């Protein structure tokens, strides 16, 4: 096999067994097998998925050379995984010159400019979240936060990117919000993931029978819901559809289906991604209290007796910032950052072979004794203007770095924000019946709770 080939190069790793590589191995999740892994193996390492062979960096340096530096020449692409579709025109998961098209297309629909016009429609749900929660204190109810976090998340996708305008919390049987919850992210150790990665050569049999990843009941809903949407009706706007098709208009020439796959993409990027990051924060928050009373407090002197968030009034909540990020240095919920590696190099004194998967264990990076104190701990003040100075920004990464980052990291950081404000000024959270005290992380291929999280609301 290739399974000689670390051996070869003299770099160290877990011994892979014939057909599964290392894969046995992930029986405790991606996270705590990279942890291992690091600790026992150093700054470098190798390992095998099925016969694929993956390399994990954690110098700072090379991270950056291969994110930034050499991402157009070298190291431009993820990994291929599974069966795709059309879909292979989504951006995420398109290659090469295909790529770089797509990101230079859609980059205007990401500038901090119309993020801010997007404001106004994301606040509108700001409140509709609100009344929902009320409801449930009021009422003593103990909440499913990835429950309503996950209905405040489709509503803003729904509304800035299609305009589609609903309560999906209260009306779950609506045919867009329907299957439009959709797309939930890949458990790529799950049984199916499993075997393409054993099997990859059955990969193109799947495409021929156009077997897709992705449900081709919810991509044909939506093919034709987008469609349908372009009578043109309009026959203004700020959403991400229309930002979207008014690019084709005056390199370039946006396809009418590949808009539809990023329409896909973006929310299969933001749905579950900004649910599960909002439900972290809240649990940090439930249980670490001076840290929520802090975080409000900050809240109420930047927008006084409740006021309304705003674009420049956001950025301007300084501990708020922090308690997003220390969330995500926890919690990086991409878990490892990939590419692959395309041409034979040397790179910051050592030699990478072609077609060899280059990985970064975010995770582990962000749990790593060398580079955070007491690295288990929920502590915000590691961000605070003293301190933030020490962190390595190839040591964190939970939105990538270089060409290829977090596309949508703006937006992301934006939309958690004034959800949170808008919660905090309302509301507090507390620990309760459930709650799983320490969390206990999922060891699926998902980074999530084993439970979900569960906690009081009191209206302030
Ligand atoms: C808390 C929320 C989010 C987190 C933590 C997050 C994190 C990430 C990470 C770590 C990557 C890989 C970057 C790399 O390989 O260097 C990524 C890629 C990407 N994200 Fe996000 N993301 C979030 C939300 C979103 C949203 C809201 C959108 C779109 C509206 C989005 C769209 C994308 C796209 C399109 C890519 C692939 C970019 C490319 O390949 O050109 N993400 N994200
Ligand atoms: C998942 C696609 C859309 C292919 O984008 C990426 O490659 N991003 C990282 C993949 C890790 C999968 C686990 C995962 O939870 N995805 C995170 C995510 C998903 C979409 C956008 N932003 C972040």
């Not at 901090?112 to 409140?127: C, F, N, R, W």
């Not at 940090?284 to 705003?310: F, G, S």
């Not at 709770?449 to 302030?460: F, I, N």
Request: hydrophobic content about 40%; glycine content about 4%.
């Amino acid at each position: 096999h290739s399974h000689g080939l670390f051996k070869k190069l003299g770099i160290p790793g877990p011994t892979p067994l014939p057909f599964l590589g290392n894969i046995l191995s992930y029986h405790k999740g991606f996270c705590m097998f990279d942890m291992e892994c690091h600790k026992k193996y150093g700054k470098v390492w190798g390992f095998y998925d099925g016969q694929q062979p993956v390399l994990a960096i954690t110098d700072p340096d090379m991270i950056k050379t291969v994110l930034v530096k050499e991402c157009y020449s070298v190291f431009t692409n993820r990994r291929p995984f599974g069966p795709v579709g059309f879909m292979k025109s989504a951006i995420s998961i398109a290659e090469d010159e295909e790529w770089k098209r797509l990101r230079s297309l859609l980059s205007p629909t990401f500038t901090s400019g119309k993020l801010k016009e997007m404001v106004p429609i994301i606040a509108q749900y700001g409140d509709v979240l609100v009344r929902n929660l009320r409801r449930e204190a009021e009422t003593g109810k103990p909440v499913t936060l990835k429950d309503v976090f996950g209905a405040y998340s489709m509503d803003v996708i729904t509304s800035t990117s299609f305009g589609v305008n609903i309560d999906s919390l209260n009306n779950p049987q609506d045919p867009f919000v329907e299957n439009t919850k959709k797309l939930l992210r890949f458990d790529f150790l799950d049984p199916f993931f499993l075997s393409i990665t054993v099997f990859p050569f059955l990969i193109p049999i799947l495409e021929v029978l156009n077997i897709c990843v992705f449900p081709r009941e919810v991509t044909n809903f939506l093919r034709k819901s987008v469609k349908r949407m372009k009578e043109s009706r309009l026959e203004h706007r700020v959403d991400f559809l229309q930002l979207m098709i008014d690019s084709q208009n005056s390199h370039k020439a946006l396809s009418d289906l590949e808009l539809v796959a990023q329409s896909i993409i973006f929310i299969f990027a933001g749905y579950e991604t900004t649910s599960s990051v909002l439900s972290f924060i809240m649990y940090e928050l439930a249980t670490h209290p001076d840290v929520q009373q802090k975080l409000q407090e900050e809240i109420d002197a930047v927008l006084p007796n409740k006021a309304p968030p705003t674009y420049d009034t956001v950025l301007q909540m300084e501990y708020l910032d922090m308690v997003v990020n220390e969330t995500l240095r926890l919690f990086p919920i991409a878990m490892r950052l990939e590419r692959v590696c395309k041409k034979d190099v040397e790179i910051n004194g050592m030699f990478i072979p072609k077609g060899v998967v280059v990985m970064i264990p975010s995770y582990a990076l962000h749990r790593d004794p060398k580079y955070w104190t007491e690295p288990e701990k929920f502590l915000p003040e590691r961000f605070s203007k003293k301190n933030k100075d020490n962190i390595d920004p190839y040591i964190y990464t939970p939105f990538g770095s270089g060409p290829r980052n977090c596309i949508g990291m703006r937006f992301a950081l934006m939309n958690m924000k004034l959800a949170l404000i808008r919660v905090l000024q309302n509301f507090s959270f507390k620990p309760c019946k459930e709650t799983q005290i320490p969390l206990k992380l999922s060891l699926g291929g998902l980074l999530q709770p084993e439970k979900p999280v569960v906690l009081k609301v009191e209206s302030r």
